[PDB]
């Protein structure tokens, strides 16, 4: 079985992690989903779960052609429940974030730790602090997730359509997720680690 499933089961084996995962799983299930309740439970998960368990659960490696592994990784946070059905403009998302003191705090942290210092992936701080700040956005108004079940790219649920005079500022925000060597290499490194750990 794939390593995404294995790391999910490592969480299940841990009484504390299993309880936190079941809790958001329950809050984020079904078509009857209550978005704000799911988001609260996700925030709680990443807040309270042991970092190695939370990172293993989400930042799990998938072979080239393992669509099932990637689909699992992509749905681990229950994006159909957690993300709005309609993607807003990305700056609006940031605005909503600024409007909430917890979210505002989480965005500042991510902007601090995941700032790229060069094309090699050097972060402003450390790789591990970047990952922590990144996962700290999950359950906020700016919840990032994997875009594909065949690759490891990650993005917000937003668009830069209807941006007008604010096109570049908008694409710049998207770029912090799509075109960020620090974030990309921190995720890729952790995934390599998880592969090598099991091997």
């Amino acid at each position: 079985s794939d390593l995404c499933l294995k790391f999910a089961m490592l969480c299940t084996l841990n009484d504390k992690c299993d309880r936190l995962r079941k809790a958001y799983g329950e809050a984020c299930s079904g078509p009857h989903c209550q978005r704000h309740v799911c988001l609260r439970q996700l925030l709680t998960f990443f807040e309270k779960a042991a970092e190695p368990h939370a990172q293993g659960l989400l930042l799990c490696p998938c072979a080239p052609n393992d669509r099932g592994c990637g689909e699992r990784r992509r749905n681990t946070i229950a994006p159909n429940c957690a993300l709005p059905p309609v993607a807003p403009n990305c700056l609006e998302l940031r605005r909503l974030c600024f409007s909430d003191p917890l979210c505002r705090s989480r965005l500042v942290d991510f902007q601090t730790h995941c700032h790229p210092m060069d094309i090699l992936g050097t972060c402003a701080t450390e790789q591990s602090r970047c990952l922590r700040a990144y996962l700290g956005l999950i359950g906020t108004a700016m919840t990032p997730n994997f875009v594909s079940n065949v690759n490891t790219s990650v993005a917000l649920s937003c668009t830069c359509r209807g941006s007008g005079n604010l096109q570049e500022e908008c694409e710049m925000l998207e770029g912090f997720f799509s075109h960020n060597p620090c974030l990309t290499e921190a995720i890729a490194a952790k995934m390599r680690f998880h592969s090598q750990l099991f091997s």
């Binding site: 079985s1 499933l5 089961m9």
Partner: protein
């Protein structure tokens, strides 16, 4: 040995739920003896069963003790084979009693 909450990891696929999964889940259930507050009826039932004075009825044999049963429950949640989260209410025991 006596009546208590028990816990095991089981294949979601064994739960008889229809949704298919490759996950294991923690499932809790109740089992064990309720030999404590022993009632006159149960004492005599047990005596008669022991003396073989009762012809066995059709079906299940009678029990000469209260049964270890759940008194409270919690939901079970898992991702199915299509990576959709599913939840079933009141599937797993969280407390037991001699009922």
């Amino acid at each position: 040995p006596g009546c208590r909450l028990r816990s095991q990891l089981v294949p979601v696929r064994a739960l008889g739920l229809g949704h298919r999964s490759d996950e294991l889940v923690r499932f809790r259930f109740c089992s064990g003896s309720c030999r404590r507050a022993r009632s006159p009826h149960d004492l005599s039932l047990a005596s008669l069963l022991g003396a073989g004075a009762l012809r066995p009825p059709p079906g299940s044999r009678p029990v000469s003790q209260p049964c270890c049963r759940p008194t409270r429950y919690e939901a079970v949640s898992f991702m199915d084979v299509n990576s959709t989260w599913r939840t079933v209410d009141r599937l797993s025991a969280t407390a037991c009693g001699c009922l």
